[PDB]
Structures are given as C-alpha cells and as structure tokens.
Amino acid sequence: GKSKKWKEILKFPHISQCEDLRRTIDRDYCSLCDKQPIGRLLFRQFCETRPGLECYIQFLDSVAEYEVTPDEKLGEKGKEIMTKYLTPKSPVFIAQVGQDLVSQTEEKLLQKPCKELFSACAQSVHEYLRGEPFHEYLDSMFFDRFLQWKWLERQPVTKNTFRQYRVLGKGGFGEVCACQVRATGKMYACKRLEKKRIKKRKGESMALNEKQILEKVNSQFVVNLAYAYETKDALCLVLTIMNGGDLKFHIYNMGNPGFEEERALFYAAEILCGLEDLHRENTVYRNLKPENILLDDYGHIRISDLGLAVKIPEGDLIRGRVGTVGYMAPEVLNNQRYGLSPDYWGLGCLIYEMIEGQSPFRGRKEKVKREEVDRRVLETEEVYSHKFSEEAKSICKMLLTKDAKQRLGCQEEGAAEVKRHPFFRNMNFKRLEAGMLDPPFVPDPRAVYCNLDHTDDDFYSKFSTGSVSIPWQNEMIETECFKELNVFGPNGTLPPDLNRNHP
Template structure:
C-alpha cells in the first residue's frame, strides 16, 4: 500500500531541493527572467527625488542599497576613500581579540593619524588639533580615546561635502531608480511556493522562490481569519514595522511584505540550518560543546544589543526562535512579541 502522505512529502522535498540548486546556479530560464528586470528610467524618479528626505543616516547607513552606492561613490574620490579606509581599519581593531596584534594595530592607527600622507597635506578628515594630540600620545588608553575621536571626525567629514557630492552624482540617481523599482507592487504571483517549513498559531512558514531571480526566502503566512479571531492584527503589523527598521546580520531580515485575500505575508531570510532546539536535542550527543555555546551566545547577544539600540525589546528568546544558516551562523527570528519602547512610557501589555 502506498503511503500517500510520505509520497507527497518526498515530492515536496525534492522540488524544494531542486529549487535551491537552481537558485545557486544560473539556468537559461533564470538568465532570461533577469534580463527582464529593468530599472525604471531617470525620468520616473522626479517625484521621489523631491519627496525623499536627504538624511545621511537614513540614506547611507540604514538602507543597504544606499550604503553600497555611497561606498561605491566614495571609492572614486581618493580623499574620501582615505576616510573610508581609516574607518574600516578602526572597525577591524575594535572587533579584534585582545592581544599583542590588537595593541599593534592601535598604535598603527594612531601613528597614521599623526603622520600626514604627504608634506603640507594633512588628512582631509582629521582636524590639525587631533593630529597633534596623536603625535603626543604615550599610553594605549590615551590612544584608544584618540581613535574614537578620529572615528567621530571621519564620520562627520563624510556627512558633509562627500554626502553633498554623492547627492549630485549618478550614484544617487541610481539609488533613486532602485527605490522606484522597490515601490512596485508585490503579490503572491511574484513567488513560487514550495514546502511548508513550520507552523504556528497564526499560520505557517513556507519556502518560496522569487520567479525573476531564483532567490529563495522563507514566507511567513499569517491567516487573516485567525488573526482577527485572536486579536492578533496589531501584533502582526508591529512585527512588520519592527522588521523594516532592523539591519543586523544576527536577526532575520525582511525582504518583501504583501497581502493576499486570505493572508498577510512576510518574506524573510531563509535559514537552512534548522533551529537551535533541533541542534541541542536531535543532532548527535544531546547538548552543545562549550565552544558552540559561546559562539551562539555572542551572536544572539549582538542581535539583542541591536534591538536595544533601536529601543526594541525582543521578549521571546528561546532555542526554537534561534535559526542557523548554511554556514552555522545564527539569527534571531519571530519578532511577533517584540515591542517598541516609548520614551517615558512603561510597557504593560502581555
């Protein structure tokens, strides 16, 4: 007797794995679809050019496309690229493990700030007063404080003339074209749906593939009737709004959001490594080695700290909500219970 349930599951798994394989390759069909992905012309950007606030933080830090194009623009101007190179080296120093190499990098950073790249041409992003203080620094504690000041001056420098030049460049025109492209309506016909990855109280999560690009995502489908019955509409909208604000490698990211007649859909990062509960209880010997505990704890802490920096409280930390990717890195997921803290107002809701 044929096990129809098992057969259906086998077919679903095969289709899903084949879709993942296709998305990683470059089939002729995908090539044809990608050629149809044309950015709108510059003439269609006039309205968004007027309406979009010219805010450095919003354009060049929060938005991945803006951040990428701003960096590409800075790379075309040597004095601007000099500031970027310093910030990258300073970030590398901050993230390095404690030890002689980190101390050596710190001294190199301060020495670079103290020494002009050429006679009569000081660093464009540093004030002469700070360069003089770097020359006189003697302790690592003093050097660390000076690097922090130099980072602040470098960021202030990039937000001034370089940012104005970026707004007048073709790189910003390209950014506007991408923003107009992002505003095109998205519906379920934009995706091919594959197997169900999990189920919850308000719906299910399934694997989907963007038809035009072949890229795989996880789609959280929230049933409108269940949301209304359980008064979950506010929670669903809150999760969408919070996901829109987040930009962290340690939290699942929102790629698309749309609604059908029956569902609210949040299309997010696809995490193929399973959840942490599965790895703790179902893979090999029960439990995790201490090295992995430290690794995952550090990544989860980075995700929580990012949320706290935005005034958001997660409120749902558990192994089931920590998902792993193909490389073994973890991300926090399911922000349905997360809340935004309002200044001076306590949170009293459940």
C-alpha cells in the same frame, strides 16, 4: 537561479521617472551614505572618482579593520594606519583631521592601545564628508543612480515576485515556505497568515504588531523582514531563511544533552546581541526558549517567532501573562507591569539549559504539573553543577534573579551590563558582531533536521507595505544583481538611462 530576463525586471528606469523621488527623499547623510547598503556603496563609488576624497574612504576601512583586530596586534595595525594616513608626507594623507588631532592620537599609540583609538579621527572624517562631499554627491550621477535603485525598491510586490517551494514548518496561525525571488534567486521563508483565521479570531492588531516589529529591527541575530505582501486569502511575511535547525534540537538531539560552556558562550553572546537590538527599539521579546533560537547555514543563530513581541512606549510598562510554561519570568507569572526584564530572565534560562542539558526548574526526566513548575520559578533557587564555571554560575543566577529590579541587564545600563560580565570575559563582541568568530557547529548543506467587508480593506493597506528597504538593498548586493546592473558609461560618462536628453 535568476529568472531569465531578470535584467528586464530590474531594468533601471529613466532618471526622468524619479523626479518625485528626488523631491521627497530626505537628504540625511547617515541614511543615504551609510545605513542604506546601496547608498553607502554609491557614495563610496563617488569618492572613488575624486582623488581628494579617495583617501578618506580607505582610512575608514582601515579603522573598521582596527576595531576588530586581535588585542595582541593593535599596536602593529595601529602604527600602520599612522604611517599611511596620518603622516603629512604620505601620498594618501587625511588633511581634514587637524594637526591638533594627529598629534593627539599619536599619543594613544605611545601607550597600550585601545580598539577605539581612531574613533576621534573617524568622526572628524565623517563630519567633513557630511558637508561638501555629500552635497556634491547629491548633484552627481551616482545619486541619480541611487534614485533608480530606490524606484525599483518601491515597485509593487505581489505573489508574481516570488516562487513558493516546500512547506518549512508551521505554527499557530499558518505555515512557512521556501520563498524565492524570481528576479534575484534569493531564498527566504514565508509566514502565511490566512485572512479567514485572523479575522475570525480578531487578531489583526497582533498581525500588524509583529510585521512592524520585524520591519524595524535590523539585527544580524534576529529574523529580519524583507517583504510584506498580501495574496488572495492570506497575508504573507517574507523572512530570513534558517536552514540549520533550532537550538532545542541541538541541545537534546545533538547534545549530551547540553553543550560545553565555551560553545554555550558563543550562542549566548549572539542571543544577547539580538536582545540588545530589539531593546534599542524598546521592544520586549518575551518568547525566549531554545526552539525559537534558529541556526543558519553558517552556524550563527537568530531569534525567531516575534509573535509575542510588543513595542513598549518609552517610560511606560506593560501587562501580559504570556509565553511558554517554564520560560516565564516571575513578574510575568504574577501578571505585573514589567518592561524588558523578562528577556534577561529568558537569557538566564537559555544559558542554564545550554550548559546543563535541562531547564533550571524542571528536570529533563521529571514529570511535573504546570503549577509546580511555576512555584519553583517564584520560590525555588536553581542549583548548579560542575558543568558551570564560577563565572557561568554567576551570570546565570544574576540573570535568574527573581526580583526584576536586581536582575542583570535590567538597570538603565541595559545589555551593556551583561556584556561586561566575567562570563563573557573571553568574548570580543566587536569581532562577533562583525561575524569574524567561527561558530562551534556548522550545519551540513544537505542536512534535514525537522469576508467582503471594507474595514478589512484598510487592514491590508497598512500591512502589505511591500519591500523593506535595507533588506531589499542587501538582497540586490548578495545576489550580485547590483554589481551586474550598476554599470555606468565607459570612461566615466553618462549611460543612456542617466542622461535626461534621450529616454
């Protein structure tokens, strides 16, 4: 699906074009060698040349595999890492973790193993690469190549960059599309926001608020922002495409209604990880309802529709009676100053509704007024059935605690208090965050579930910021544009584009 001549659109600039990039990029090791996908790869590729550095990359890979190994096979995997990397006689031995560190970790294996047994060594290893190897990579052809990729990353994005397809739904301020990048062929989802409608309503602040929240979140379980460009007559937001339908459809149309507890467990775990990633940016979602939880092609879920989401200043609370009837926490209904607590209430609503096949305060076959629904939320205790295990009852009623001060996860411990709950006792969040747990339902690939003012000029300039860095680099990797273009000279020589001699 890559546009003919995509190798020209993504043609590397000559390294002489990136001098202004060199003198402005902050040389942070974590960002340049880990956070940014292409930087991580290029730094890993730099270590692939040195024999002394090669060993340290293989070890970190094996530690990553140890973290997600089943508990019954930790001692097995653990011993393998010792007799390969931590033995002084090995051909590929880690020398920078002092002998006074190898002898320590050799003891944790003399007892029941923990999945973080190698965290001390991995951090020691990183502190070594953080110094001499990193600064040598900065003066290497691979960091010059990184700059070339950054140069491309910053190129202007317009409509020309994309190839609009069918309308994949609509909302309250525009429609959705099936974006495709012509150069890479990766599918996306637009969120068109017609300029006429946003100016008339005076909601420019909410448009940028959403785009900036979507841009700062980098979760596997929340819709991510890849591009933000402006078209004549609209402001677009290019988001993760989700083709598996929403969770409301699967609860009520595919369901009993409702799911088996173990299946609801899986979706709850991923929704909780999404909420945790949002809360890292002290951002409250406030729109948690089954139809906003979408499924992708693999069966995993992401939180969508962040239009009612707000970034809370650390140490401050906010007001806002917003959301959907039936899914508003008590502190929200009372128009009080709250923080992240509404989201753990919503989680309770979602777990309950997934298991029971109806909302905890409104019967599926009940005809009630908005006001009676609200009274129940403030006054009535929800009742449970035999569909809920004792653990499921617990987490639900602790998340559905009316008082936001005693509500689960609303303490200073945050979402960690929720992952520790006996309801997730059989859930390994390390393996879930890594994508190694098979979803309970896989959508079929063929399935189909369904004016001239100048002050406005400044608002487009702050919004239409173009490509988002981490998603863009991931796009290049997924589509194998990186593997194909990231070619150097034969036998570790400089290719023409990285040789300052002849442009």
